[PDB]
Amino acid sequence: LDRADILYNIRQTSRPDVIPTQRDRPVAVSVSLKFINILEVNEITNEVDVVFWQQTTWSDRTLAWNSSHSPDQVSVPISSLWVPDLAAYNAISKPEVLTPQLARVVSDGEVLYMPSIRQRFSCDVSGVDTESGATCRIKIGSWTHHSREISVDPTTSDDSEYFSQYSRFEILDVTQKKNSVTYSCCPEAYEDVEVSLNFRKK
Amino acid sequence: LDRADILYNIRQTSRPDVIPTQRDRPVAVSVSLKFINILEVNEITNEVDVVFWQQTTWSDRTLAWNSSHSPDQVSVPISSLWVPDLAAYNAISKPEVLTPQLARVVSDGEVLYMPSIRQRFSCDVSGVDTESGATCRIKIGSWTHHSREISVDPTTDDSEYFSQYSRFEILDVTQKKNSVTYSCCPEAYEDVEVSLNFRKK
Amino acid sequence: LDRADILYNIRQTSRPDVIPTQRDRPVAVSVSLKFINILEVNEITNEVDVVFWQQTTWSDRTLAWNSSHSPDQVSVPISSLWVPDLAAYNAISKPEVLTPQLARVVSDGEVLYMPSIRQRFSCDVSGVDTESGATCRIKIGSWTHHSREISVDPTTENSDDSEYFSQYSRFEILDVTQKKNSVTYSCCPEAYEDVEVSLNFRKKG
Amino acid sequence: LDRADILYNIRQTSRPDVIPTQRDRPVAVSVSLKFINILEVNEITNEVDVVFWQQTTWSDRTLAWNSSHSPDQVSVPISSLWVPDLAAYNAISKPEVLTPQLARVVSDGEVLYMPSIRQRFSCDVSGVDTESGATCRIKIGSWTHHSREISVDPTTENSDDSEYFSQYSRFEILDVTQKKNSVTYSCCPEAYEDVEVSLNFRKKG
Amino acid sequence: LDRADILYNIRQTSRPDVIPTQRDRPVAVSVSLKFINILEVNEITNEVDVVFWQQTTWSDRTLAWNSSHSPDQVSVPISSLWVPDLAAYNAISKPEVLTPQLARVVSDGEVLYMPSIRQRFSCDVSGVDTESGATCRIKIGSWTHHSREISVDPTSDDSEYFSQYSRFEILDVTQKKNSVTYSCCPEAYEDVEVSLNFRKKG
Ligand SMILES: FC(F)(F)c1ccnc(N2CCNCC2)c1
Ligand SMILES: *[C@@H]1O[C@H](CO)[C@@H](O)[C@H](O)[C@H]1NC(C)=O
């Protein structure tokens, strides 16, 4: 197979509306934010403007091909793929996607989508101008898929290594935990990754 | 049926342009706002910038499937579904939808659409910096379907999802049904009126 | 016919690019602005930010159906319909449409399209902080159709100029008047019709 | 032919991607700017925000029809037509098109496209608050077609270049001239033709 | 062939999603920024707003035609062409494309795409009001194609295109090739680093 054949096959048999669950197990989605910049912090309103690479990985076996005299990977427009419906619960602006909207698909059906996003958050900015700094928590999970359909897990120094040396701010620490929440309305559990960004004015 | 079959059937047959009225009775739409944030208040201009989850539910029987050895629910792009044409009558900006535009469809044809929306309103901001606070009324109803085609009802903690990091806090939320007749048009339009009583912390 | 049949027929035979002229008479378009809010006034730059409902009506006989044991009216996306190419000549921003882009179509082929629009205008803001107030004139007509293809008229008005106006605006409406104009430009030998809407308003108290 | 037939024929055959060159001569495009407003001037940054009608005319014979029992002209969405790839070389914002994106096509294949545009420019703002005023030059030509493929000329008439200017602007127009230029860069051998529009304007007393 | 035939052939056989690799060698992409204006500089936040022409060239042999009694070149909408997925790694806004989105295609399959772009960057603004000026580095490369799929290479007067009406003037522009390798993955991503040495005028 050449690139042209693989991309034709993916475009023609692309079910972008269909979550690729295997045998009623959840799709395991990995999410890791790599922080690039902190722009416009406001300690009065508790709002921050962040630029991050949102490293997103999952398996879609319907994309797989035999790699034996073929590329191992191709670049695919995300309009031709199912992508997880991730939202940041404490975002107060739409994600501004700064990069071309292409994912990498590996011959085994692994997808890597890593957009550069600028987005504004409501989070704790208190202490930003002190030595111990502020801790801004960003929560990301599926908007519509519960834990039996999508599971989200952090993956793990690249979370801070590629931060802009020209920001007014610096990163002290980044920690990630998984949360699984059931609300009173609804019997299902929703997973999110909580990313704690500890940063301060340089 | 698997998810792929159900989503193929919905995409091929859903008629997004067609209100799913049963026997010329109105489609009963439920609307409830969960307030998430209050971002910018201006007592001089009487304008507020709010973030809310707009919990919207209705039945569309044309979506229904037999759930025996099948999923009970699927996620569907709203471009593949009829959605009620709700507008906030006192909005002074377009709704900024912060979340993926997917609804949940249950095998019986119940649809749940809950976008997170940031929007600016013209409403009463007077008293925001006092103990009893301001009361901002938001009115949401069908832009083009009168009461014989769409009925809107509120659903049966006001701050359980509200950001602890807002400069503002919620004292009270009430959501009641109204019916409006304009000079233009002889029919009545139903709306839910949401009274947000809030103040500076 | 049910709603599904009517909407299928309209979607399948929709010529949105085709002005529905009858026997080489102009399409008669009614336009009336209902003011909802005045948001930002600048007396230095002579600029206003306004929110209005643009009540627009016309006939398209190709949409008509027999209403016997059928709905009298349906809601149709404007992407499935011809809509008049109206522009406000003194707008300095694109119209921000706040509402779902649906019109009402009556079984006789009457169309009613009433979007809520936020838009900025260049107009006379002088006197806004006086008792007699400012008079901001907004001119709306067809961008490309002359008087033999589109005629614009004011609608009927049977209410208060401020029946829908926000009680929370910094401004109040004293009066709204609408006149028809027919204008010939240097470019073009034909006459273009417009409605001129005079918004007389002032700062409150 | 009726409007529906003409618009169907144009949509099916117009080739919007194909420059309508006749016998390997350049397509003659006329450009004239009609100034409507000057909104924001900054003498420190040398930036202006202008509203203009960009009157654009050319011939496309592939659009022509026999007018003998037929309309002489139709309104056509520009998505169904080849349009020249005009850019203002000194623009520092995307053109904000304020008007419906329709051109007028005459039965002989003449096209008139006149969008109302708000756009920001880098130009000489020095002297804006003096009696003789500033002279801001705006340069408009093909982004990708050199002089053997597109020729750009001012229109023969510029009588009306200020006729439509807002009386409510903080600025007033002293003079407009529109003249033909060529740009060549040293790298690359082809000349690109442009219209240079010299807007002599000042702050009002 | 006339223009109509060439453009019909390109539109009908356009694989815009398919990188035109020849015999599994990388597509050689040339990038040169021609600076037109510097509009807003902030020495506190280290942010600049720039207007540049992004001169981009590559070969796509699937576009080639016999130029005997035919045009040497045509203008093609970029929606009908594969274009490299270039991103500026230190951009903090989406590229605002000011110009019609047409490329020039030569009969041998060379493509020239030169959009005018306004974009905001995080870079070193220190010294902008001094004689030696600031040096703002912009890094541009493929978002998803590593060095075996896309190579980026730099290509007269640094201020031949620059606005005489800017508050700023250009002292020097240099363009150099860089390579990044991330810890996860053995593949290198190439970029062009464009060093813009500029200052506030007298
Ligand atoms: F997480 C990072 F930043 F280390 C990482 C890992 C793997 N690939 C990356 N990129 C970012 C630039 N474009 C594609 C390669 C980046
Ligand atoms: C649903 O499907 C099951 C199993 O195939 C069947 O027993 C049942 O009768 C079905 N119900 C309806 C109403 O179709």
Numbering used by the authors:
A (entry chain E): 20 to 175, 178 to 223
B (entry chain A): 20 to 175, 179 to 223
C (entry chain B), D (entry chain C): 20 to 224
E (entry chain D): 20 to 174, 178 to 224
Sentences from the paper on this structure:
AChBPs are homopentameric, water-soluble homologs of the ligand-binding domain of LGICs and well-established structural surrogates for nicotinic acetylcholine receptors (nAChR). LGICs are activated by ligands binding at subunit interfaces of their extracellular domains, thereby inducing conformational changes that affect the structure of a central pore and its ability to transport ions through the membrane. Additional density was found in all structures at the interface between the subunits in the orthosteric agonist and antagonist binding site, next to loop C in which the respective ligands could be modelled.
The unit cell was comprised of two or four pentamers of Ls-AChBP in the presence of FL1613, FL1856, FL1888, FL3044, VUF24234 and VUF6105. The electron density in the binding site region was generally poor, indicating that compounds may have had several binding modes in the site. A computational alignment and superimposition of AChBP taken from the protein–ligand complexes and the apo structure showed that there were no large global conformational changes in any of the structures upon ligand binding. However, there were small changes in the loop C region of the crystal structures of Ls-AChBP. When comparing the protomers in complex with a ligand we observed that loop C moves differently upon binding of different compounds. Notably, binding of FL1888, VUF24234 and VUF6105 results in a movement of the loop closer to the compound, while binding of FL1856, FL3044, FL1613 and FL1909 does not have the same effect. The plot indicates that binding of nicotine, FL1613, FL1909, FL1856 and FL3044 do not result in any significant conformational changes in this region, while binding of FL1888, VUF24234 and VUF6105 do.
